Write a protein that binds this ligand. Structure first.
Ligand SMILES: Cn1cc(CNC(=O)N(CCc2ccccc2)Cc2cccnc2)nn1
Ligand SMILES: Cn1cc(CNC(=O)N(CCc2ccccc2)Cc2cccnc2)nn1
Lengths: 304, 304
């Protein structure tokens, strides 16, 4: 028993991290097969970031200007191309540590592990959710760009995120591995609005089920609700509307606990309207939304 | 910016995990050099756990009864010995993935990363603190025993914990890598009292400094306090007494923020006496105590 914000084991991703330097800018890159993926702003100086013309900046660069270092050995760059906001550096050596992998674009509300890196070296790993407004509440400092987000299914690493920037608001923005930003963000030093964020309702309900499984049941009540009644409450508290798709994914947790989804919704409704009254759920004094129904099942079943 | 419960990258530890089976019991082992370390209860059946005589149970076992599997290949066991609550299985092959390592006994209040494993395979990684009462609030299921806790300083893995059991209260108990339990616990299926736990005061203060560095400053007040006045408040709220040793370790954070330790103590005092008033600090609605001053400095400086 016990419930933790658990990240995937980061080993398969650590073996892919490299350092990419271009001019005086250094960041992290991801070496998979014979390609190194990194944020395209590696070609900019701080001065270029105000309004970069990446196409023009990249034209001044040749393969030999991109210094790629894996551990202590240098990689020979034989090709370079820009795909959206990422650069793909073709190297003459395939990464011997390349795991089975896929590039996936995750949906808002889904979770993933981030391996924060500096100078191509891993510093830490943490679990987070892609917010409904397509930002992540990460922990990243200058030089962390190129650090990636991922999920693992047995031996396959699904890379879903590459870190690019921090908004003036302190939240983080990045791309999928094809360089497409999640959200309306652009890789430019300009104040950018992240949308109104909302709470991931299906994840809070999944976490309430995890709480029941682990013994925290004080929040269970004698009430039930409807999807429409619950959504009136969700609207008021900036929770994303719950759909039958969300109820369907909660099926296994509802079956395991014997608590109908709408009954769990009524508990969530009372928690929203009354607060926690100074109590905690799974060691938290707020409603946690960074665990999907799949994460709860995985953690509660010990999937390796 | 941003502050997360960050774990160390688990790669160096993943390369050490093996599966140990003895009779019908299977758990995790740690393969370092030519030795596999695992909980000694691997030799027990569920029936033996009520009151095991480990010395007598181990005498019925030979090297060939301990099946050690690393990935898909079998390890040949050439020696076995019991040291406190761990078995050391000498194998004929040194682990090629053995990192630079040390065995350390951590102090209560210190933090570490846990790589939860099942059947010798890693499932997840999370950061936790050794509680003042020598329990850990982990996330472990049956079969997780032998999963280890560790810290990493550049290339050296300091193993500090091996998971053994879950108390009837839902908290976890284990040993150092010499098999000495942290706390008064015994590896037996008997109800065991964990002491009264307390909040790790120096860690909460470290986390309040991390909050200031990251922009959360609403809790800062115009007050100061003394060590004696603060400790009267800590006593009342089951916080560990703050000592000059704790103030000394908080020096770097106090210097970085310009907030004297006793001034931060006065903010903590007001938070203890008034609560959070429905507000949050670093995304938490309670006072977090699982980040040491060293963790705050490491995360806020990007040490790899
Ligand atoms: C040596 N060096 C400096 C840099 C550039 N800076 C960064 O690392 N970040 C921002 C880059 C950026 C700025 C404006 C529009 C787009 C992108 C990423 C970041 C920083 C802080 C917190 N979270 C993320 N890269 N390598
Ligand atoms: C196949 N198999 C079964 C087991 C035995 N069971 C376990 O894994 N645990 C307890 C063993 C134990 C019991 C009583 C006194 C000492 C030790 C560890 C645990 C379980 C649940 C949550 N956290 C930790 N090991 N391998």
């Amino acid at each position: 028993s016990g419930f933790r914000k658990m990240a995937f084991p980061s080993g398969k991703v650590e073996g892919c991290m490299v350092q990419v330097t271009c001019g005086t800018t250094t960041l992290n890159g991801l070496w998979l097969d014979d390609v190194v993926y990194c944020p395209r702003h590696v070609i900019c100086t701080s001065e270029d970031m105000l309004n970069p013309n990446y196409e023009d900046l990249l034209i001044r660069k040749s393969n030999h200007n991109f210094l790629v270092q894996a551990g202590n050995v240098q990689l020979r760059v034989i090709g370079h191309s820009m795909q959206n906001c990422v650069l793909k550096l073709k190297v003459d050596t395939a990464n011997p540590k390349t795991p089975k992998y896929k590039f996936v674009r995750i949906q808002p509300g889904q979770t993933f592990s981030v391996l924060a890196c500096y100078n191509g070296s891993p510093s830490g790993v943490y679990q987070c959710a892609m917010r409904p407004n397509f930002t992540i509440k990460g922990s990243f400092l200058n030089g962390s760009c190129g650090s990636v987000g991922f999920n693992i299914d047995y031996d396959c690493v699904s890379f879903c995120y590459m870190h690019h920037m921090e908004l003036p608001t302190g939240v983080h923005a990045g791309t999928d591995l094809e360089g497409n930003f999640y959200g309306p963000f652009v890789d430019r030093q300009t104040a950018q609005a992240a949308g109104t964020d909302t709470t991931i309702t299906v994840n809070v309900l999944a976490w309430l089920y995890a709480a029941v499984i682990n013994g925290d049941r004080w929040f269970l009540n004698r009430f039930t609700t409807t999807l429409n009644d619950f959504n009136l409450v969700a609207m008021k508290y900036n929770y994303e509307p719950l759909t039958q798709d969300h109820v369907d994914i909660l099926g296994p947790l509802s079956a395991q606990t014997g608590i109908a989804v709408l009954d769990m919704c009524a508990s969530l409704k009372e928690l929203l309207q009354n607060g926690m009254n100074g109590r905690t759920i799974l060691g938290s004094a707020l409603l946690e939304d960074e665990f999907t129904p799949f994460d709860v099942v995985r953690q509660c079943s010990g999937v390796t």
